[PDB]
Amino acid sequence: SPWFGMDIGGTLVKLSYFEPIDITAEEEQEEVESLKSIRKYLTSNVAYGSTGIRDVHLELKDLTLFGRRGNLHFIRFPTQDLPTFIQMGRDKTVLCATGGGAYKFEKDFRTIGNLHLHKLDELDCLVKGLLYIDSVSFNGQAECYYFANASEPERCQKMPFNLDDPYPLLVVNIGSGVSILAVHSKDNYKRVTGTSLGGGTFLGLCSLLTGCESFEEALEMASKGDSTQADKLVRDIYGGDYERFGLPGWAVASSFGNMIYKEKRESVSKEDLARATLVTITNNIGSVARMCAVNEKINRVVFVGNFLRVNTLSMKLLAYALDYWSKGQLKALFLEHEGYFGAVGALLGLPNF
C-alpha cells in the first residue's frame, strides 16, 4: 500500500506522499499494476485534474522514513473537490487522516472498499509534522526562517533560523480560521485560543468587496492597493500621533473606518479594498498572537497554514508588526512547508496501525 498522510481542512486538502526510491528487483516485479500506476501518475504529473497541484519545490529528497529511502511529496487540492478524489479512488491502503474533514467525510472514505481510515487530531499532527520537518531539514537548508531587520525596508531580508531546542514555541495556524498553540515539549502542548478572523475571512470578504475569483488574484489586487484609502488612521483622528500612549500617526485606528463616508466609498478602488482586507486580517492575527505570547511567556511565534503561501505581503507585515508592537520582544518565524505539517504528522502516525 502507498504511504499517504492527509489533512482535510475546511478549504484545502493537503496530502503528503512518500515515494520509495530503493525499490529492489524482486520488489519491482512483485508490485501490483495499480500500485505501479499510482506511483507513476503522482510522480510524472505536477497538475492532477483541474485543481490538484504538486508543490515540487517543497519535495524532500532521499529521506529515510520507516527504514526506507524515498522522496516526500506535497500535494494540495480544494476540499470542494474531495468527491472527485474519492471517485478516482474507487476506480480499478491505510489512510491516516486529520483535519475536520477526517470526521466529516469519514463515511465517504469508507466507500473505498477494504480501505482503513485512521483519524488523527488536527493539532497533534501539526505539532508532530512541524517538529519532524524541521529536524530532517529542507534538503539541508533551514526549514525555519525570519525577516532580519524587519523594521527597516532597505535591510529587511529573509534569513534562516535555528529550532534545535524548539521549546517553548507559539504556533499560529492560519487556515480558514486561526488556532493558536503553546508548545512546551514534544508531548506537552495546548491550544491557547483561536480566532475566526483567518484566511477564509480574507478570501470571503475580498470576494464580496472586489469580485476576485482566486486567492492569488486577491493577493495581486492587494499588492496594487492602498489600505489607507479605506482605513481610518490615528492621524485622521488626532491630526498626528497620539503621543501619550505611544500610538504613531500611521497606526490603524479603525479598519475600514473611512468607509462610513459615502464619498470615500465611491472613490475607493477594488485594489484598495483588497489591501485593507489583507492588512486588517493580518494585523488582527499578529495582535492576537502577541497577546497570547505575552500571556504564555513565549517569545518565539511561528506562523503556519496556507494563508501565508505565496503571500510575502502578510509575512512582512507580520514580521514588522510583531516586532514593532512587542517593542522587539517577540520574533516572527516562518516555515517553508507552511501548510503541510498536519499531512506530514498524519503520515507519521502510520506505524501505530
Ligand X SMILES: Nc1ncnc2c1ncn2[C@@H]1O[C@H](COP(=O)(O)OP(=O)(O)NP(=O)(O)O)[C@@H](O)[C@H]1O
Ligand Y SMILES: CC(C)c1ccc(NC(=O)N2C=CN(c3ccc(C#N)nn3)CC2)cc1
Binding site for a second copy (CB under 8 A): 9-11, 80, 99-101, 103-105, 121-123, 175-177, 191, 193-201, 203-205, 207-209, 213, 230-232, 234, 236-240, 242, 244-245, 247, 251-262, 265, 273, 280, 283-284, 287-288, 291-292, 294-295
Nearer to ligand X, 123 or 169 (CB): 123
Dist CA 63 CA 80 (whole Å): 31
Site for ligand X, residues 184 to 223, rule: CB under 6 A: 199-200, 202-203, 215
Candidate ranges 26-34, 58-66, 116-124, 211-219; the one touching Cl ion (CB under 5 A): 116-124
In terms of Cβ atoms closer than 10 Å to its own Cβ (0-12, 13-18, 19+), residue 185 is exposed
Based on the shown chain and the rule CB under 6 A, indicate whether residue 307 belongs to the binding site for ligand X.
Answer: yes
Residues with Cβ < 8 Å from 288, sequence gap 6 or more?
Answer: 178, 180, 193, 195
Q: Which residues have a Cβ under 8 Å from the Cβ of 342 and sit 6 or more positions away?
A: 7, 9, 14, 98, 99, 122, 125, 126, 129
115 binds Cl ion (CB under 5 A): no
Given 30, 106, 122, 143, the catalytic residue: 122
| Sign of the alpha-carbon dihedral angle for 327, 333, 334, 339 | negative
CA distance 332 to 322: 6
Q: Does residue 122 carry a catalytic annotation? A: yes
| Contacted entry of ligand Y, Cl ion, Mg ion, none for residue 194, CB cut-off 5 to 8 Å set by kind | ligand Y
Element (H, E) at 238: helix 234-238
Residue type, 55: D
Q: Is 207 in the site for ligand Y (CB under 6 A)?
A: no
Point out which span in 169-177, 205-213, 221-229, 265-273 binds ligand X (CB under 6 A): 169-177
Give whichever of 74 and 202 is closer to ligand X, judged by the CB atom: 202
> Considering beta carbons, is residue 118 or 270 the nearer one to Cl ion?
118
Please tell me the distance from the alpha carbon of residue 332 to that of residue 146, in angstroms, as a whole number.
Answer: 6
Q: Does 10 bind ligand X (CB under 6 A)?
A: yes
Cα–Cα distance between 226 and 88 in angstroms, integer?
Answer: 45
> Which of residues 166, 225, 286, 342 is near ligand Y by CB under 6 A?
286
Residue from 2, 20, 177, 249 that binds ligand X (CB under 6 A)?
177
Window 164 to 183, contacts with Mg ion (CB under 5 A): 175
Query: Is residue 218 a contact partner of residue 204, using CB atoms and an 8 Å limit?
Result: no
Backbone angles phi, psi at 295, to 5 degrees: -70, -35
**DSSP-assigned beta bridge partners for residue 97:** 6, 119
Residues at the interface with Cl ion (CB under 5 A): 118-119
Where along the sequence are the contacts to ligand Y (CB under 6 A)?
10, 100, 177-179, 193-196, 234, 237, 242, 247, 251-253, 283, 286-287, 290, 321-322, 325
Annotated active-site positions, please? Answer: 122
